[PDB]
């Protein structure tokens, strides 16, 4: 399971006729690190099978 | 039935054609949309939180 806790806001900027640039306004709440979770026991079994 | 074909996975041409086709599909979908080359300027950056 992978997650990106930050709550971003996208802001649009006009740089020419019909040309738009999508910047980032700010973040609502707290700034937290993105991360991924794996289960330890299942990974242990998988590594044991791979070693075998 | 009654058949045994000699297979090889390291020398087949399907992988090369799939690679070049994926590259071509990636390239042709970036033509219509915006070309960001006024953005190469001198930025001025600060920390977001203090």
């Amino acid at each position, epitope marked *: 399971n992978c997650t990106r806790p930050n709550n971003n806001t996208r802001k649009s900027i006009r740089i020419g006729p019909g040309q738009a640039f999508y910047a980032t306004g*700010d*973040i*609502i709440g707290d700034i937290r690190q993105a991360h991924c979770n794996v289960s330890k026991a299942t990974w242990n079994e998988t590594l044991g099978k791979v070693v075998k | 039935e009654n058949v045994t074909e000699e297979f090889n996975m390291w020398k087949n041409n399907m992988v090369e054609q799939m690679h070049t086709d994926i590259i071509s599909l990636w390239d042709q979908s970036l033509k219509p949309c915006v070309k960001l080359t006024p953005l190469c300027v001198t930025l001025q950056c600060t920390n977001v939180t203090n």
Partner: antibody
Amino acid sequence: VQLLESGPGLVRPSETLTLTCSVFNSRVSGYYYSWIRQPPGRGLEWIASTHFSLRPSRNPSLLSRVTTSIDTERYQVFLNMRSVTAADTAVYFCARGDASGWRADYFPHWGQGTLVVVS
Amino acid sequence: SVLTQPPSASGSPGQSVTISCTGTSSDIGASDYVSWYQQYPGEAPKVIIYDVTKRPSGVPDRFSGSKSGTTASLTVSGLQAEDEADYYCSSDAGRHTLLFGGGTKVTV
């Protein structure tokens, strides 16, 4: 997070109020910042609420003269109400919402407060 | 101050006190955003009950909220000598507009 509030002494009957509370260990962005006021006897009526990128709100009984804003470079928030009367003299607190950043219902963090007696 | 409370309440140690906060249907019956605060005479208030039936971390679990129709009730059970403080009720009245109450000074 620390909220340090400041206001100038005693105010004239026609001179406007300028209130500012600096934030410490916070971004002054992504959080709802609100002002609440209580007269010496009893109180806790809320003046206004602000956010950087979302819609603010004002008290209908004071919507006429509430012009509040925020400053990101210096991490400050300004009430800057005007057209003051002698009857609204009271002490002010500034507060911010929870870690969610989108709720202005309850205000966990608060500040010291200021007297701001009207002369 | 649309929301109103009884001016004061009292009791004895080891007893329970119930405080009622009332409002119109559009005020309290619209949503569950109801909060209760306490403040000492020389200090700023702090949140004790938020979202009617939830409490902040690191507080004694001796307070509660019922949302009885359009009226909210706060119960304090097993009060002590240092639980004497004013109790304010606040609620949301649409467009991020809060409405407070007159407060209830609990003495013992």
